[PDB]
């Protein structure tokens, strides 16, 4: 049917960062002498090859400096007889960075049996990034433990992502006592902060 | 008299201030509030919610009749294992608007 | 297929919340940001400003270019001892909208 | 031209607190047999006389329970015989009352010659009021002096207004020490409150 040939009726597309610079969009075609530009919305903004920088290659498909269709929603290549199109590649821009991780209170928690443990761990990071959190520590026999993950606001507008995971145990024992690793996970790049939790009477 | 120029212009003004149902776009991870882990494309949807202003305080602009509407939108999570994976969710859009009192 | 359903309606979707100029209501009030003792009837104008949501978090939705809008509205001051007297604000009205990097 | 006849081409109306609860639009007209209604926007709304309660007298114009134009920015009466209409009326609801005018500190102010003083009064009213501050020093010899007027935001949403007026001196001298008082005024309604400010070596 189409001279353009890529799984699923929708692919997509990684801008992590340079460089190159360049991403590319697998817009693999049928024949070689084919004039293919790379469209991009929202709002619509046509790109075509500048050799060398901005290429389609019939085994490659389309090369572009990321920067150009960041902004994008989504992409499609777009070659023309007399206008055929690639699938839609939806845009999808993705941060690694971790600044720093810190944990709240972040030096000697002392602690009495019954006592309530509040560990508030913070990661902050570069623009387009999640986290996901993982903890370790001492009980991890289940004993009246509560974990909320939270988004506060870094703008201020800086140029930066503030993240919140809050530890709770409500009746501390000495069973509890030891040491509490927080783990921030941001893509694939992953910074790792502890303290140690002291229980006496 | 000149005072037909001023008069046209501002019960145009009230007319397009009013209380009424209006398009805008809604961050959808903020209404479903979802997670430090996860993004949507796209960021938002184009819903109708209540807007314009009330000539007395005391009465604020709300909607009294609302439909609902599921739009499909991809998630994602990270670290990414997947996949951006199809999802719906169901936000609520107005259909009419009153200022009605406060309390 | 159905995935041309949920194509269809999720192009149409990031269409509807780009970033655009956008008819909103401004209180007036709060931009001149005037007084305790001062009222605006109209207590609004209806002007556009950009709007919309940017793909990319580093880039958010602002004006390239802006004209500006003189409208009369008649101010009230208390105690009242006038006496509704037609005054005229200047009004930013933004005509074009681009989302650009945040610094 | 016309049988409606009532200064300026726009008149004004204001809502002051009940009762009686209705207000007059004056749309005193040249004849008597007249079926008027009271055209209220925005939104469009009309209202018939049900006598007796809304009525149309034609030595008296219109009469609404307020109520039911409160919401409205304009208002006009409108007779047909086959339509007229009167000058637009500019609706003002109008609120009086304050509740209560706080100074802070409220009590025992003790500065020494040099000091910066600074005075907060503070308003809070029901809704639809604006005020005007005036202030009573002992010195007014005009001696680094300052004052600004702020509007706190209730909400809360509660179901009400918060003022805030600021004075300020930077190096009070002993010609200063005496009463200062701060008044609120919202509409006729005006509440008075002092404090004593000392000032020694
Ligand atoms: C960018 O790096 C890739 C590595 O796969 C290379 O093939 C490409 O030629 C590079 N670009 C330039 C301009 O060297
Ligand atoms: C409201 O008070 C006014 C006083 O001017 C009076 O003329 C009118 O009749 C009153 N309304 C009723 C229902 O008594
Ligand atoms: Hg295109
Ligand atoms: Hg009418």
């Excluded at chain 1, 997509?12 to 460089?19: D, G, L």
């Excluded at chain 1, 050799?51 to 400096?65: A, E, L, V």
């Excluded at chain 1, 530890?167 to 941001?186: E, F, H, K, P, W």
């Excluded at chain 2, 776009?25 to 997670?35: L, P, T």
Aim: hydrophobic share 35%.
């Amino acid at each position: 049917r189409s001279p353009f040939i890529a799984s699923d009726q929708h692919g997509v597309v990684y801008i992590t960062e340079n460089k190159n610079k360049t991403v590319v969009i697998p817009c693999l075609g049928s024949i070689s002498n084919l004039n293919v530009s790379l469209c991009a919305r929202y709002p619509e903004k046509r790109f075509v090859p500048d050799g060398n920088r901005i290429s389609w290659d019939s085994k490659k498909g389309f090369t572009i400096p990321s920067y150009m269709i960041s902004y994008a929603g989504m992409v499609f290549c777009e070659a023309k007889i007399n206008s055929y199109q690639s699938i839609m590649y939806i845009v999808v821009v993705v941060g690694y960075r971790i600044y720093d991780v810190v944990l709240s209170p972040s030096h000697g928690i002392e602690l009495s049996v019954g006592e309530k443990l509040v560990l508030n761990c913070t990661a902050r990071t570069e623009l387009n990034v999640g986290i996901d959190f993982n903890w370790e520590y001492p009980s991890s026999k289940h004993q009246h433990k509560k974990l909320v993950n939270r988004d506060l606001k870094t703008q201020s507008g800086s140029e930066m992502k503030k993240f919140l995971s809050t530890l709770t145990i409500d009746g501390v024992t000495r069973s509890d006592q030891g040491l509490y690793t927080c783990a921030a996970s941001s893509g694939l790049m992953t910074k790792k902060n502890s303290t140690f939790v002291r229980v006496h009477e | 008299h000149y005072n037909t120029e001023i008069l046209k212009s501002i019960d145009n003004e009230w007319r397009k201030t009013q209380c009424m149902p209006r398009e805008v776009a809604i961050d959808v991870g903020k209404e479903f509030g979802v997670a430090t882990n996860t993004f949507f494309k796209p960021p938002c949807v184009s819903v109708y919610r209540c807007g314009g202003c009330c000539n007395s305080e005391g009465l604020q602009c709300m909607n009294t009749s609302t439909s609902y509407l599921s739009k499909t939108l991809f998630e994602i999570t990270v670290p990414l294992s997947q996949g951006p994976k199809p999802v719906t969710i169901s936000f609520a859009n107005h259909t009419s608007c009153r200022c009605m009192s406060k309390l």
